[PDB]
Amino acid sequence: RELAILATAENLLEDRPLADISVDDLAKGAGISRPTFYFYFPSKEAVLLTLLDRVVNQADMALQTLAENTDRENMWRTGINVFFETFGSHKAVTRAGQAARATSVEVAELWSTFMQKWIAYTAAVIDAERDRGAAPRTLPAHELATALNLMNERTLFASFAGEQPSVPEARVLDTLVHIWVTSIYGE
């Protein structure tokens, strides 16, 4: 029933913005009354927050699975691909979740927390690559990590929403891997 509210919201968000989805459409879709909805979620905005929180955590867990477990270009491609596949499978939640950063402090703070985590892990892997002699000591690892992660956030999300301008979705993984591998390994 919680699940049916979440699935209904994900479905309707594929059609239209969260401003055009009412608690009645979410209730209707989950086969419950509007007061019954209020027992599971305080708002349609909390439904979006929860949807976003699962996509982010699904991306984070898939990155942890890689971390616990090739050539350097393929190492980076597999990591970036976790975010391409995870967000790319949940485009309506990606789009809605990004738009809510402007209006929800909880969505802004959720996004900020996982970006800080994914930057810190990028920096740790760049540092390990520098310690093993594979990557040169160029920029501060954490500053290079930050720019590469903000690049991916902006570029993946533009490609997914078909923005003008954007890298076509079928070219965006290759585009990002090239810039990551050349900026991490290049002198």
Ligand X SMILES: CCOC(=O)Cc1nc(-c2ccc(S(=O)(=O)NCCC(C)C)cc2)cs1
Q: How far is the CB of 99 from ligand X (least distance, A)?
A: 15
Number of amino acids touching its own copies (CB under 8 A): 39
Distance separating alpha carbons of residues 107 and 101, to the nearest angstrom: 5
Which among 22-30, 44-52, 60-68, 132-140 is the span making contact with its own copies, rule CB under 8 A?
Answer: 132-140
Distance separating alpha carbons of residues 52 and 98, to the nearest angstrom: 9
Site string for ligand X, 64-103 (x = CB under 6 A): --xx-------xx-xxx--x---x----------------
Residue 104: φ, ψ to 5°? -120, 120
Q: What share of the chain is helix, strand, coil (3-state, %, to 5)?
A: 80, 0, 20
Distance separating alpha carbons of residues 176 and 187, to the nearest angstrom: 18
Told to check if 55 binds ligand X by CB under 6 A, we report no
Out of ligand X, its own copies, none, which partner does residue 76 contact, by CB within 5 to 8 A per kind? ligand X
Q: How far is the CB of 17 from ligand X (least distance, A)?
A: 21
Per-residue burial over 146-170, b if 16 or more Cβ lie within 10 Å, else e, is bebbeebeebbbbbbeeeeebbeee
Out of its own copies, ligand X, none, which partner does residue 94 contact, by CB within 5 to 8 A per kind? none
Which residues are near its own copies by CB under 8 A?
Answer: 99, 102, 112, 115-116, 119, 138-140, 143-144, 146-151, 153-155, 158, 163-168, 171-172, 174-176, 178-179, 182-183, 185-187
